[PDB]
Amino acid sequence: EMETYVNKLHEGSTYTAAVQYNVLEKDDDPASLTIWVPMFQSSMPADLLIKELANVNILVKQISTPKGPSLRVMINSRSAVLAQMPSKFTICANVSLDDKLAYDVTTPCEIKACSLTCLKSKNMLTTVKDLTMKTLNPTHDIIALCEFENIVTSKKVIIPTYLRSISVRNKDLNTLENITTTEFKNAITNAKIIPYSGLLLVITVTDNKGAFKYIKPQSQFIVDLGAYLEKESIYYVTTNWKHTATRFAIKPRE
């Protein structure tokens, strides 16, 4: 038994699979950690692929690298389609680990939950890094304010995540309508936050005007929240933090 989650944010038969496992070390006093698999494309219907993703075996090994502690992940599978999926990769230990793991010892883990999110094909995904350097002398930073309610404690949590920097004409500041266009505002209001990279904000870019200038129309603009979750348990977060709204701020730089 295992919890499974399928989020279809795209209708294509072909999609980018964004997969995240919550796992428990097979031991007494077990380490708890979350693994996200490098994105890969598939054309197997999501509701079938999740069945295959649920039947893998995971091992991890904590290592030291120039960037700090890292987790080497190995995924065993008898499912033909998972030839499509990376089987060996590394992720940052600080985001992955809740807590409890020895170094350089390959460690089997029990899968508690598997989440599969279907995104657009990779050529239709835009990252924050993609937009860095598009404006050389920005005047403002655009921040998404991701609001959650912890359903156990009823407390509200806001994670402010950086989207991009932009230069705004003086004339445009008086209403901001040419920057925070109708398309932009709706896209933020309707943004989704899914279980990947800890959490991943996904904004559908419906236009390339204003705050969306230089982005490919109809792309999904994907943004990491994992850097803000290093001191949390990701499994606790994806189980207990309910995404209640997404707001934005267009902050002057200085």
Is residue 175 classed exposed, middle or buried when 0-12, 13-18 and 19+ CB atoms within 10 A define those classes? exposed
DSSP string, 116-148: EEEE--GGGEEEHHHHTTS-SS-SEEEEEEEEE
Q: Tell which phi-psi region holds residue 104, choosing left (phi > 0), alpha (psi between -120 and 50) or beta.
A: left
Q: Point out which residues pair with 221 in neighbouring strands.
A: 126, 203
Q: Cα–chain-centroid distance for residue 223?
A: 6
Question: What SS3 state is found at 158?
Answer: strand
Residue at 105: amino acid letter: V
Name 130's Cβ contacts closer than 8 Å, sequence gap at least 6: none
* Token couple for 128: 């924050």
Burial 120-153 (b: 16+ CB within 10 A, else e): beeebbbeeebbeeebeeebbebbbebbbbeeee
Name 1's Cβ contacts closer than 8 Å, sequence gap at least 6: none
What is the CB-side half-sphere exposure of residue 249 using CA atoms within 13 A? Answer: 12
Gap between the Cα atoms of 186 and 206, Å rounded: 9
Going by their DSSP bridges, the two strands 156-166 and 140-150 should be labelled as antiparallel
DSSP letter assigned to residue 178 = T
Q: Point out which residues pair with 62 in neighbouring strands.
A: 71, 103
Gap between the Cα atoms of 37 and 56, Å rounded: 12
**Residue 44: phi, psi to the nearest 5?**
-80, 130
Name 218's Cβ contacts closer than 8 Å, sequence gap at least 6: 120, 124, 204, 205, 206
Is residue 11 classed exposed, middle or buried when 0-12, 13-18 and 19+ CB atoms within 10 A define those classes? exposed
Residue at 39: amino acid letter: M
Gap between the Cα atoms of 147 and 74, Å rounded: 34
User: What count of residues does the chain have?
Assistant: 254
Are the beta carbons of 18 and 39 closer than 8 angstroms?
Answer: yes
* Experimental technique of record: X-ray
Gap between the Cα atoms of 81 and 23, Å rounded: 22
Residue 52's nearest CA partner among 23, 82, 29 is: 82
What is the CB-side half-sphere exposure of residue 48 using CA atoms within 13 A? Answer: 9
Please provide the CATH number assigned to the domain covering 1-120: 2.70.20.30
Name 33's Cβ contacts closer than 8 Å, sequence gap at least 6: 22, 23, 25, 60, 71, 96, 97, 98, 99, 101, 109, 234
Residue 242's nearest CA partner among 141, 149, 171 is: 149
Kindly tell me the sign of the dihedral angle through the C-alpha atoms of 53, 54, 56, 57.
positive
Start-to-end C-alpha separation, the chain: 52
Structure resolution, Å: 1.6
Residue 155's nearest CA partner among 240, 245, 235 is: 240
DSSP letter assigned to residue 185 = H
DSSP string, 32-93: EEEEEPPPEEE-S-HHHHHHHHTT-EEEEEEEEETTEEEEEEEEE---GGGGGS-SEEEEEH
